[PDB]
Amino acid sequence: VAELKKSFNRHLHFTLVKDRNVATTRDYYFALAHTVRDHLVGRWIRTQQKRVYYLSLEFYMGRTLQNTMINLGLQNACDEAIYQLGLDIEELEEIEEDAGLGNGGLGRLAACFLDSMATLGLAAYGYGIRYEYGIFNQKIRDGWQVEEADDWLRYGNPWEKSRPEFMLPVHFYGKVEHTNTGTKWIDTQVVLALPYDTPVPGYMNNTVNTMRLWSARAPNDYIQAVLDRNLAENISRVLYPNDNFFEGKELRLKQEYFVVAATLQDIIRRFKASKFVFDAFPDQVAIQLNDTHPALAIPELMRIFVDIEKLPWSKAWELTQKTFAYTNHTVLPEALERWPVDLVEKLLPRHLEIIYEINQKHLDRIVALFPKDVDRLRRMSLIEEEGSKRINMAHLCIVGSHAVNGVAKIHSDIVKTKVFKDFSELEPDKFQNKTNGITPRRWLLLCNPGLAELIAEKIGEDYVKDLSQLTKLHSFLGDDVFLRELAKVKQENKLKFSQFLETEYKVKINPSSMFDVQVKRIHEYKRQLLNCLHVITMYNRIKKDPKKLFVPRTVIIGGKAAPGYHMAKMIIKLITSVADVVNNDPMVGSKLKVIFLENYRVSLAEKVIPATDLSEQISTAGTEASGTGNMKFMLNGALTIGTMDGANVEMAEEAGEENLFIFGMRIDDVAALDKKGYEAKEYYEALPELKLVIDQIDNGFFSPKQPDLFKDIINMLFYHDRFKVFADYEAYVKCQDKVSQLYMNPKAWNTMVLKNIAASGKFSSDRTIKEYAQNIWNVE
Amino acid sequence: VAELKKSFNRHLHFTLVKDRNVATTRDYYFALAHTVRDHLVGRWIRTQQKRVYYLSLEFYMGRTLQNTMINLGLQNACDEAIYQLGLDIEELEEIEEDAGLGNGGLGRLAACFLDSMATLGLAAYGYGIRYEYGIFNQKIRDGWQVEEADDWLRYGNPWEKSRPEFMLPVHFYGKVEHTNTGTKWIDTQVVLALPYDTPVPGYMNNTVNTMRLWSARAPNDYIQAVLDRNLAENISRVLYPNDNFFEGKELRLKQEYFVVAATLQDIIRRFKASKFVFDAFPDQVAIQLNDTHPALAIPELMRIFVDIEKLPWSKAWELTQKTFAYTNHTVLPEALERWPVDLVEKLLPRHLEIIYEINQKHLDRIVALFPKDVDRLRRMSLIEEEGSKRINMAHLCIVGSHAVNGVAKIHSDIVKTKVFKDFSELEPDKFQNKTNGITPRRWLLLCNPGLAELIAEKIGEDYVKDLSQLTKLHSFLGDDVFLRELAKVKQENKLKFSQFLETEYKVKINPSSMFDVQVKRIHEYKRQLLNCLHVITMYNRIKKDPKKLFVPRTVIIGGKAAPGYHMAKMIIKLITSVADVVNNDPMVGSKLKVIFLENYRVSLAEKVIPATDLSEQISTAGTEASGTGNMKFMLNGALTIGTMDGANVEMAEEAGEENLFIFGMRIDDVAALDKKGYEAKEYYEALPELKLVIDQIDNGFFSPKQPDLFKDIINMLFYHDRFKVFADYEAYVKCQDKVSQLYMNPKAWNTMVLKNIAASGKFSSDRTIKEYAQNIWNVE
Ligand SMILES: *Cc1c(COP(=O)(O)O)cnc(C)c1O
Numbered sequence A, B: 001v002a003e004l005k006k007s008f009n010r011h012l013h014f015t016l017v018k019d020r021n022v023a024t025t026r027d028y029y030f031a032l033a034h035t036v037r038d039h040l041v042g043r044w045i046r047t048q049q050k051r052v053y054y055l056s057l058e059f060y061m062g063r064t065l066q067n068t069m070i071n072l073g074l075q076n077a078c079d080e081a082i083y084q085l086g087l088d089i090e091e092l093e094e095i096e097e098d099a100g101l102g103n104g105g106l107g108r109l110a111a112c113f114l115d116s117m118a119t120l121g122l123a124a125y126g127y128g129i130r131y132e133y134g135i136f137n138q139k140i141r142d143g144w145q146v147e148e149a150d151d152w153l154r155y156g157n158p159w160e161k162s163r164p165e166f167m168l169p170v171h172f173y174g175k176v177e178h179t180n181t182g183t184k185w186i187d188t189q190v191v192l193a194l195p196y197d198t199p200v201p202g203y204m205n206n207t208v209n210t211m212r213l214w215s216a217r218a219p220n221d222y223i224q225a226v227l228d229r230n231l232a233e234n235i236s237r238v239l240y241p242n243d244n245f246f247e248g249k250e251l252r253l254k255q256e257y258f259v260v261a262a263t264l265q266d267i268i269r270r271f272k273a274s275k276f277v278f279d280a281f282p283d284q285v286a287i288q289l290n291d292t293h294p295a296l297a298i299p300e301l302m303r304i305f306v307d308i309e310k311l312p313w314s315k316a317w318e319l320t321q322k323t324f325a326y327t328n329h330t331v332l333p334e335a336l337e338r339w340p341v342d343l344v345e346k347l348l349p350r351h352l353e354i355i356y357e358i359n360q361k362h363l364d365r366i367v368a369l370f371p372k373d374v375d376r377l378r379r380m381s382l383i384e385e386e387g388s389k390r391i392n393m394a395h396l397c398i399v400g401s402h403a404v405n406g407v408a409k410i411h412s413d414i415v416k417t418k419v420f421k422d423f424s425e426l427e428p429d430k431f432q433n434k435t436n437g438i439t440p441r442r443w444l445l446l447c448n449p450g451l452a453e454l455i456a457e458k459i460g461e462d463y464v465k466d467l468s469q470l471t472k473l474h475s476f477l478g479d480d481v482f483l484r485e486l487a488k489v490k491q492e493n494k495l496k497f498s499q500f501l502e503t504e505y506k507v508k509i510n511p512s513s514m515f516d517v518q519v520k521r522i523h524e525y526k527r528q529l530l531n532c533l534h535v536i537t538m539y540n541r542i543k544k545d546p547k548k549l550f551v552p553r554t555v556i557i558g559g560k561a562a563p564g565y566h567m568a569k570m571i572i573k574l575i576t577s578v579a580d581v582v583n584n585d586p587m588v589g590s591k592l593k594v595i596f597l598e599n600y601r602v603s604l605a606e607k608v609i610p611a612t613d614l615s616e617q618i619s620t621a622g623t624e625a626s627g628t629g630n631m632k633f634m635l636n637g638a639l640t641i642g643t644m645d646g647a648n649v650e651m652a653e654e655a656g657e658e659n660l661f662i663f664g665m666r667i668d669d670v671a672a673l674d675k676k677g678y679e680a681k682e683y684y685e686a687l688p689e690l691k692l693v694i695d696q697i698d699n700g701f702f703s704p705k706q707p708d709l710f711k712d713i714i715n716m717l718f719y720h721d722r723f724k725v726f727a728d729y730e731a732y733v734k735c736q737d738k739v740s741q742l743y744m745n746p747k748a749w750n751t752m753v754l755k756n757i758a759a760s761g762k763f764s765s766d767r768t769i770k771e772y773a774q775n776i777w778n779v780e
């Protein structure tokens, strides 16, 4: 403890240039971060000197100090030293800005994968773009959504480390010149790529992997010419905000090309400097593509093999196929990347030529087998020419990889059988399944220390490594003291989150109330509108007769929206209006409060997840591939309600469908409704409560100033409904009534909570990473 | 020594994240810089907790590590430790990038002033803009000038330190609102100002002052909106390249306003947090304005006193006058700032109103004394309305300060008597004289260690503090061994610089040759064209008859030009053409070489100054205010030739006019020639050598490809000559012949060198800072 205090004081003195009489809390935080980095740096150095290379455009890391101290096993001594110094740890932690470099589940899964590979001892690297601005910081002004820039690097970064040695040139634009010896790509602008190294420690395993982020620079080759160096740096400037939607901008194509080029050149440099010549490259380099975003890594690797290395074309394509593995995350038609040919030709002419060459070879190979198939010729191509010609990047990832994945069992089946039937039937073993997972360290040990300690008191500490040990908690279903203590830790977390909520939102929180939380990105397919309709329903139920007993229920809905997405903004406005009406009704009192959680992120989830009682995953069945939020909920002692979709099917299989509240129509029923013809007015006319709620929304009950504030939402619900909000309202209300009736009995509620806890060990990210290593990457 | 090795190794381990088997030389340099910063940080902290506040737009610092180790007195132990590690110190030093934040003499004088205030123990601060790009890096391509961006911060900065605590808001644009209580300036854009602290150690005195640089940021209040945050950061981006010329851009006005606003608010914050209420402000804050660049500090201080503090107008103006002191650096009519009223009104409406108010009060005060003077009413105003109305910022600095200065005795006399006669006769004691100086530490102890050690062996080490002890070297004029050893150290420095030159320029350097150097910014008034004409003259002299004896003379001319200044670029082209012709003549051999020094800066001057034999300061008399280059030359054992101008008059007074080679027409003779009517053709027709040189230039002798390459230079020399190049050629040639004849005798040359060395103690910056403190700032 004395050594850590001396190190902290020395870092305050020399590194910060400060004394105890002037240092702010930010300086103390920086000193603590520097001393924990000094604690990890020796093993980081030792680890730096087959390998996996994970290539994502997003890494939703969050906050580092607490996770690093948990993974290093230095919490007791550090907390004791901070106490003896005379400081609090909560404000020091709150000083740190989150690395909000991911939009949502994809980047969060990438970060969990990095933590799992570090914990399992694998030799892996992370690769991405060092965005100076994350998603954004969200604030509610006049009940609306306003976005402000997220400057997470203004005050410094005590974790990353620039590497001047490994700066690489990335070329843009130009022309193709044909010569006898190779193909020449010339007249190109050069953009520099500067790497920054962020450690990724493993839990108690002496392994510190690396997260390398590429920072754009300018070549040094007049004032306006100096002010135009920002255009080269305009890539790596700001993370794009779309969660699933695909824009099609010339920017973010430069970002994709920049990251894939820099990463491929860095790995090739690392391989050439090894003892290993390119016939062993697929045996030493496995490149995992998170989504269709790093799809240009296939033609770029082809360009390096065929032009810079002048390898034979056939061998180069063989090595590229043996090196790449593909993972699919979305199925939504508007969520699929299709870059127009003209934009790529302007930006990447050599890559467009390589894409045409790969397409021609693949089409000839397919037409050899199927002389009769003419429509298959158009279907299986890498180019779509219905209007303007566009490049199906998913097809390019398919043909260029030796594996293809889905994020869930249902999603894997859909992509293999429905989405990519033509590719799958020819290559049956290529298409596989890997169900997502969440790291126990960040989401149980860091997120919920009380529940983690309670579990460790029963089944030991071995569950951290392998989450499947949670099944040993089934032996404690008979005991009642354990259920009481479980409810007690839930109530303690609820009290802490209520302390947060009261100060932050100026609303009094009933502490015995059920915490009903729905945190996710605001999408139409995620159906926050159904939750809004339900809260208006139970508000009207309270208004009808206050004599009847009601369940004390706190409703929390928090998530960001795309800045250009109007309907999500309208849904946020409706949530804020309903919260304003319901919170300020004397008749309701402490029966129904609606809080719109603000600036939802990893750090905020580390506080709202361990206090949740009911989880809302009510997306339309067949529209969600897989979400990791419900896994965190199920891990942190929360009962889940929702549809049979995404990871909900796996959770219902693992714990039992009777231990979850499953409502709504299934995928087959959704398809049957689509075939029959969906009309929302018929559902509207046949329900009194739903009709009352919709009429109140339309009649300006929540918008006294503008009578037509929610006409957009009303028209979307009635005449252009796409995700069947009305067709699931009846089942949603019935299951919410069942939830309320079950909450009245602590015994049954705690029994189902224990059943969900003991059956969530499957959804660890260690399991997913082991499947990835032993079935795709072929490492260890 | 062992402690320093351990500290270096520990900094390599933790700070750099590197091991000895992979670390480059850059990492070793960073470790050394970090350990010397750790050596200074304790006294920096102790010093941080009346004061002088020096406000410059330029700080031409150069390289820090060597200067810091010299001022800290830690050279022997550091060199021994670096040797025992197994490294060289020269490449580690060459790793560091110069802080080229100054265009020329002004920023260099500012840096010397900071070093002198630190050395003298004063409580002073530096204030300026943290430019990400300096002047530029200069390279010669095809004999022409090309500019590349100077990215001195790409790989880090082991000296500065950001201060998040002292971020301040700077407001731009807006409108003026008139109310009963004060004046309101509203509808303004906010630009953040983030300070960075760079230490300024004093020589062996336990005083480490601060250099605070303001970095522009953006307020956090959509992709394009994120890409437009660079416009706010476009100030503090790049240093403007003009040396004396005034552009008149909307940018660099935002820079001036930004720096003055941030500095004034910071100092006011520091004063309010002290034990001292505003009646004591002039007794505790002295703000020195380097040039007319921070002229807006007067109306901004008035705005803070009258609006933010609501002090009475009369008291506020009193305090502002008692706080400010002005220093003049230039006299050239095109070098004087005159901001148009419309641009300031668009940018600073409240400041324009304050400027009008000050102007009205001053004009009323003057017209009270002089009812008859009508032309004086127009002359003494702060506004000139010949065409578009412009603000004479020099007048504003005059009226708003309690002192006014010139950089030389002649310059002070000119500004008091000729430039500002009306202001000076009313306020006789306000106008003063302070002659510039150079710090001995950087320019003798760091620049020329051999000469410094030789001097210390004779008159002790006390000369470092007070340079006036150099007069004790007059007792060694009789001895011949001392003169021989002086020539020996000159030859050693010459050998080192020849080792540099041979590798850098692919030219063989005669080591017994005289080093003829002219390093300064390429200006017409600095007359590098006269030197080019002289070198062509002696080349033709060699060509005429190689039998005649010639002096081995190496001619070096190096300096940067303004990117928009065409004539300087043409002069550089002419120098390169003449160098190409002369260097590649077999007849000349080792008699005449011309090297155009590349990328001239502080670090390069630390190598070329201590090897110089003859100094070229041949600016037209009356056009140069004062230069500090000739002071460095005279300090480092070099004989000076030139005109009676700038500091040359003071040097001739201090050492003796017979100990300098003074030629050309004086200021009175220049004025007489101007009155008579200057015609260059008459001088052209009456000289055979000059006519031959000019004909060769015009006849394409140096430009075989383009016969008319130098027609611009020829027309400027003949029909639009402004600085009388031809009228001084005769005297220049005669004095160069005298120099060559004197160089043949080592005894006379060494006698004059010793005389110049012993009479340069006046030009220390300690003398200038003492005069500033005891006559203007009233500190200590
Ligand atoms: C778990 C996680 C998510 C995942 O959201 P889903 O909609 O379930 O995919 C999003 N944000 C944060 C901060 C998370 O921790």
Ligand SMILES: *Cc1c(COP(=O)(O)O)cnc(C)c1O
Binding pocket: B104, B105, B106, B108, B519, B520, B521, B600, B601, B602, B603, B605, B626, B627, B628, B629, B630, B632
């Ligand atoms: C001394 C110094 C100057 C001063 O130049 P002058 O023309 O004499 O004013 C310029 N550059 C550097 C690097 C210097 O050290």
